[PDB]
UniProtKB/Swiss-Prot annotation:
Its main location: nucleus. Belongs to the Fanconi anemia protein FANCD2 family. Homodimer; cannot be ubiquitinated and does not bind DNA. Part of a FANCI-FANCD2 heterodimeric complex that binds and scans dsDNA for DNA damage. Interacts directly with FANCE and FANCI. Interacts with USP1 and MEN1. The ubiquitinated form specifically interacts with BRCA1 and BLM. Both the nonubiquitinated and the monoubiquitinated forms interact with BRCA2; this interaction is mediated by phosphorylated FANCG and the complex also includes XCCR3. The ubiquitinated form specifically interacts with MTMR15/FAN1 (via UBZ-type zinc finger), leading to recruit MTMR15/FAN1 to sites of DNA damage. The C-terminal 24 residues of isoform 2 are required for its function. GO terms for cellular component: chromatin; condensed chromosome; cytosol; DNA repair complex; nuclear body; nucleolus; nucleoplasm; nucleus. Changing residue 462 to H: In FANCD2; no effect on ubiquitination. GO terms for biological process: brain morphogenesis; cellular response to oxidative stress; double-strand break repair involved in meiotic recombination; gamete generation; homologous chromosome pairing at meiosis; interstrand cross-link repair; mitotic intra-S DNA damage checkpoint signaling; neuronal stem cell population maintenance. Keywords: Cell cycle, Disease variant, DNA damage, DNA repair, Fanconi anemia, Isopeptide bond, Nucleus, Phosphoprotein, Ubl conjugation. GO terms for molecular function: DNA polymerase binding. It is linked to Fanconi anemia complementation group D2: A disorder affecting all bone marrow elements and resulting in anemia, leukopenia and thrombopenia. It is associated with cardiac, renal and limb malformations, dermal pigmentary changes, and a predisposition to the development of malignancies. At the cellular level it is associated with hypersensitivity to DNA-damaging agents, chromosomal instability (increased chromosome breakage) and defective DNA repair. It comes from Homo sapiens (Human). The keyword DNA damage applies. This is Fanconi anemia group D2 protein. The chain holds residues 623 to 1244 of 1451 of the full protein. Required for maintenance of chromosomal stability. Promotes accurate and efficient pairing of homologs during meiosis. Involved in the repair of DNA double-strand breaks, both by homologous recombination and single-strand annealing. The FANCI-FANCD2 complex binds and scans double-stranded DNA (dsDNA) for DNA damage; this complex stalls at DNA junctions between double-stranded DNA and single-stranded DNA. May participate in S phase and G2 phase checkpoint activation upon DNA damage. The gene is FANCD2.
Length: 470
């Protein structure tokens, strides 16, 4: 009767079927209930008119259309939503179905693989601007409709990520494109309608808790190569995956499904699932930034998060512990082997020098401040394992001295205390920059050392005086 209770039942029972292998007689019993209850609950006939009188042009949208369009299998999502005011439980119930079928037939989904072919009985969602200024309960229905459609599509993607069949991967990518375009449509609906939020168990708060948390085997997507739309898996679907993997490992290594996984296992699994397919995309990013506005905005942010991912991964406090360092050696065997292969049984400091020699050559291809500071903290956390004071000071100075088209005060604090620690002499770094602290007045109403605005002088003053007293 309670939707909150039914979803928690389906969630907890899905947890049970996922983690514990028990007596498939029990599973054989429940499966014949749950599959048939799902196929009668939500799955309807594909006649183009669903039933009810709605102030909205109801069609069968977001098909693949490579499927047979003269079939029976559709989804009665919007008529269930209006008759509701069964449908809040769709995602967890399908998670349950999926897991039971996985446990029974050893991951054979020839039963369900008709289900990502189906359209969904929806409103014409795509415009939220022609029906602008009628901000009624209509907006709440539409925002919640798209919200549950995205959670549905996210759980489809959680299901069919691990599948190796190539046509299925193509359909999954057609679904990721649908995900990102409807995500744009949802964030625009939440932008226009300010406070009318569905809590279902403002972008940063919606992104983390309120949506479904994806798998880690879903990052079996990241293996497929780039099709970058400007130069000639797209860029913004890569932004999506990197934002998730990043915001997961952020919280972990310094969120239900992540926290039930052990931190040590997370670092182990990331090493297979990041390095030898994201290095390809890192090289593609260096090639783009070597050479229309929105593509650049996206690919700069991919690039930032990639450097942050690598920082967070290699800044792991369990490489203080020696048991994990076997993994770290195979990890540097990919950073060193990104330039030249055949160098086998190499020493630790050789791998350090190889890896930093590979990584330092990205300094020309950084578009914005943040990528540069992440790369500097990365190279610091690698080079401290071993003189290389010079490398960090020189690189810190390079990226203080570039033009940079803005920069937060505390980003710049972090970079200056990175420069001044690792320079040869702190007192001659000070006298240098306090005979540049002067021509900010005489020249600039921007100095002879940029990232030194009238704003930025306070932080340069604070950091130097801190560094001096230290």
């Amino acid at each position: 009767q309670s939707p909150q209770a039914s979803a928690l039942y389906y969630d907890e029972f899905a947890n049970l079927i996922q983690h514990e292998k028990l007596d498939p007689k029990a599973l054989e019993w429940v499966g014949h209930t749950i599959c048939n209850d799902f196929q009668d609950a939500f799955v309807v006939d594909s006649c183009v008119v669903p039933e009810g009188d709605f102030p909205f042009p109801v069609k069968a949208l977001y098909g693949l259309e490579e499927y047979d369009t003269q079939d029976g299998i559709a989804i009665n999502l919007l008529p269930l939503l209006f008759s509701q005011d069964s449908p809040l439980c769709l995602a967890p119930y399908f998670r349950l179905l999926r897991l039971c079928v996985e446990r029974q037939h050893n991951g054979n989904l020839e039963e369900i693989d008709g289900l990502l072919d189906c359209p969904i009985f929806l409103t014409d969602l795509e415009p939220g601007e022609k029906l602008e200024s009628m901000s009624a309960k209509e907006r709440s229905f539409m925002c919640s409709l798209i919200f549950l459609t995205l959670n549905w599509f996210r759980e489809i993607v959680n299901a069919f990520c691990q599948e190796t069949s190539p046509e299925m991967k193509g359909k999954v990518l057609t679904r990721l494109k649908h995900i990102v375009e409807l995500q744009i449509i949802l964030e625009k609906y939440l932008a226009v309608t300010p406070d009318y939020v569905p809590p279902l168990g403002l972008l940063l708060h919606n992104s983390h808790a309120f949506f479904r948390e994806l798998d880690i085997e879903v990052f079996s997507i990241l293996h497929c190569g780039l099709v970058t739309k400007f130069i000639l898996l797209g860029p913004p679907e890569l932004l999506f995956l990197l934002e998730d993997l990043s915001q997961k490992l952020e919280s972990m290594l310094t969120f239900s499904h992540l926290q039930q996984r052990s931190a040590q296992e997370i670092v182990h699994c990331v090493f297979q699932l990041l390095t030898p397919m994201c290095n390809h995309l890192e090289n593609i990013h260096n090639y783009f930034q070597c050479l229309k506005v929105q593509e650049y905005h996206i690919m700069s942010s991919c690039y930032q998060r990639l450097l942050q991912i690598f920082h967070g991964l290699f800044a792991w406090s369990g490489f203080s512990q020696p048991e994990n360092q076997n993994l770290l050696y195979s990890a540097l065997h990919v950073l060193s082997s990104r330039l030249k292969q055949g160098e086998h049984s190499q020493p630790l400091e050789e791998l350090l020098s190889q890896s930093v020699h590979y990584l330092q050559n990205f300094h020309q291809s950084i578009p914005s401040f943040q990528c540069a500071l992440y790369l500097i903290r990365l190279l610091m956390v690698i080079l401290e394992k071993s003189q290389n004071k010079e490398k960090i000071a020189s690189l810190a100075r390079q990226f203080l001295c570039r033009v940079w088209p803005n920069i937060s005060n505390d980003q710049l604090h972090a970079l200056l205390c990175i420069y001044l620690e690792h320079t040869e002499s702190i007192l001659k770094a000070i006298e240098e920059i306090a005979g540049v602290g002067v021509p900010e007045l005489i020249n600039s109403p921007s100095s002879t050392f940029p990232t030194l605005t009238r704003h930025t002088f306070v932080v340069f003053f604070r950091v130097m005086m801190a560094e001096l007293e230290k």
